C-alpha cells in the first residue's frame, strides 16, 4: 500500500484468520446465550454472560480489522462455521466449553504474537498485548472462579445449585 | 531521651515485640487473602475479609510505632516470620485459624497491659484500651459469629454452605 | 491449573521471590519513615516521603500477587528479612539507601522480563511494563534529583541544608 | 458533700494544687509569648506559639475544676507565682524551659494518677487518661521535634536559623 511499512503478508494473513476465530467465538456465544434462554433451560444470568460474551468477541473482530486498515493489510472474510453444539447441557458443561473455547483463542494470540515479534512487527505486538492478552487472561480468570463454584454446588442437589449459581453470582435483572 | 519520661526499657522492648507480632498477623492475612483469590478456591467474599483484616493489622503496627517514637522509645523491627501454612484449606479451616490467631494478639495486648500497669504507665495502659482492647474483642466475637454460621452451614452438604456463606454473609462486589 | 496457560514454573517462581522483594523493600521503607519521627530526627516530609514508598512497594506486591493468581500459579510467601539497618542517618545517607534499594528492585524487574522473553511470555512482559518499569524509573529520577538537591544543600551548613531541603522540597503539613 | 461519693480529701487537694500548676504554667506562656512580640525579639511565629500554650493550659485548669465540682469536692485557689524569668533568651533557650515545665505538669498528672489507683478511684484516673496524659505525650513530642530542629539550625549562622524556624516550622500570617 501507499501506507504500508513493516506489515508481512504473513501477518496480514493470519490477522484475517483471527478475524475468523473472533467471530466463530461470537457465534459460539450467541447459540451459548439463546439456549439458556430457552423455556426448558430458563437461566437468565447464563444468557446474558454468553450474550454479552458474544458481543465482547465481535468487539475483537472489529478491532482487529480496524487494525487491518490502518496497518495497510486488506480484510479478507471467510465462511463462519456453526457452534460445536445446538445444544449446551448444563451451565457446568456450558462453562467448560466457554473456557476450551478462550484457551482456544488465547493460544492463537499467542502464536500471532510470536509470529510478530519474529517479523520484528512491534506495533503488532504492542497491539495485541494492549488490547487481547489481558483481556483474555482476565476472562479466563473470571470463568475459572465460576467453573469452581459450579462445581462446589453439585454436590447431591444439581438443580439446586444450578439456580442458586445463577441467581447469586451471575448478573439477572 | 530529650522527651522520655516514665517509659520503661522494658515496655519500649515489648511494643517493639508486639509490631512483629501485628505485621506477622497482617502477612498471615495477605496469605489468605490471596489464597481465596486462586482460580480453584474462589469465594471472593472470604478473600476480602482477610485482605481488609491484612490492613486492619499493618495499621495496628504503624499505631504503636507512632506511640513508641512518641513516648521516646526507639522502633526497633526483626524479621518476620512467614505464615504457618501455604494453603489454608475451607473457609471453615481459615476462620478457625484466624480466631487462634486473633486470641494470640489479644493475649500479648493483655499481658502488655499488665506489664505497663505494673510499671505505673497509665498512657501504655490508656493506650490500649482506646485503640486495642475493644478492636480485639468486637473482631473475636464477629469471627466467632462466622465459625457458628459456617459450622452449621456444613450438614451434608459442605460446598452448598461454604458458597451461601461468602455470598450472603461476606461482603463481595 | 484450569486457567495456566503460556506460564512457566521458572515465571512462577520468580514472581514470588520478586514479591518477597518488594515487601522487603517495603519494610526498609517502613523502618526509614519511623526513624525520620524520632524526636532527635524529626524531618516530616522525610518521614512522609518514606511511609508513601512503603505503601507503593506493598501495592507492587499486592500486583504481582493479584497477577500471580490470574495466571494460575501459586503464591508462596517466605521468610522476610529486616532491614539492613536500624538508624539511617542523615536525609542523604537514607536517600543513597533508598536509590540502591531502588535498583535492586529495577535489575530484579529486568531480569524477570528478560526470562519472560526468553520463555515466550508476553503477558508477563506486558506486565512489567505497563505497571512496573516507568514506574520505577519516574522514582529512581525522582531521588537523584532530590539527591543532588541534598549534596548542594551541605556546603559548610549541614544541618541547615537538610532542614531547607524537608521544608521547601519534601511535602509537610 | 450530697453527690460526693469515692472522692478522697487526698485527691481533691492534689487536684486544687494541680490547678494552680496549671495556672502557673499558663502564666508562664503568657510571658514567654508577650518576650517574642517585643520589638527587640520579634518572633511572631514563636509570640503565637507560646500564647496559644497559655489557652491550652488555662482550658486544663478549667477542665479540673468542672471535674472538682462534679466530684462535690471545693476549689480552693492559692496564689499564682511569677513565671520563672523576666527574659527568656532564644527561641532555644524558651523551647528547652518549655519543655522542663511540661515534664513538670506530665510528672505531676502522673502522681495524682497513682493516688488515684492507691485510692480506687477509677473516675479520677480515666479522667486524666482521657483528657490530659496523652495530650501532654503529644505536647511533649512537638516541643521534642521543635528543640531538634531548632538545634540542627544553629551551627555557625545562629540569627538566620532563628528566623528560619519561625519563618517555615511556626505558624504566622
Ligand atoms: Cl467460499
Ligand atoms: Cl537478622
Ligand atoms: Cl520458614
Ligand atoms: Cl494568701
Redesign the interface.
Known amino acids: 500500500s501507499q501506507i504500508r511499512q513493516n506489515y508481512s503478508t504473513e501477518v496480514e494473513a493470519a490477522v484475517n484468520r483471527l478475524v475468523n476465530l473472533y467471530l466463530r467465538a461470537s457465534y459460539t456465544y450467541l447459540s451459548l446465550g439463546f439456549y439458556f434462554d430457552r423455556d426448558d433451560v430458563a437461566l437468565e444470568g447464563v444468557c446474558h454472560f454468553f450474550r454479552e460474551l458474544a458481543e465482547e468477541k465481535f468487539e475483537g473482530a472489529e478491532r482487529l480489522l480496524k487494525m487491518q486498515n490502518q496497518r495497510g493489510g486488506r480484510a479478507l472474510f471467510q465462511d463462519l462455521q456453526k457452534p460445536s453444539q445446538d445444544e449446551w447441557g448444563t451451565t457446568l458443561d456450558a462453562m467448560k466449553a466457554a473456557?476450551v473455547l478462550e484457551?482456544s483463542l488465547?493460544?492463537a494470540l499467542?502464536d500471532l504474537?510470536?509470529l510478530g515479534?519474529a517479523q520484528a512487527d512491534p506495533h503488532l505486538?504492542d497491539f495485541?498485548?494492549?488490547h487481547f492478552?489481558?483481556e483474555e487472561?482476565?476472562l479466563?480468570?473470571k470463568?475459572?472462579?465460576?467453573?469452581?463454584?459450579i462445581?462446589?454446588?453439585?454436590?447431591?442437589?444439581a438443580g439446586?445449585?444450578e439456580y442458586?449459581?445463577e441467581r447469586?453470582?451471575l448478573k439477572h435483572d
Open positions: 473456557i484457551k488465547n493460544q499467542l504474537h510470536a515479534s505486538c495485541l498485548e494492549s492478552l489481558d487472561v482476565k479466563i480468570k470463568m475459572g472462579d465460576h467453573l469452581t463454584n462445581q462446589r454446588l453439585v454436590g447431591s442437589q439446586l445449585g442458586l449459581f447469586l453470582t
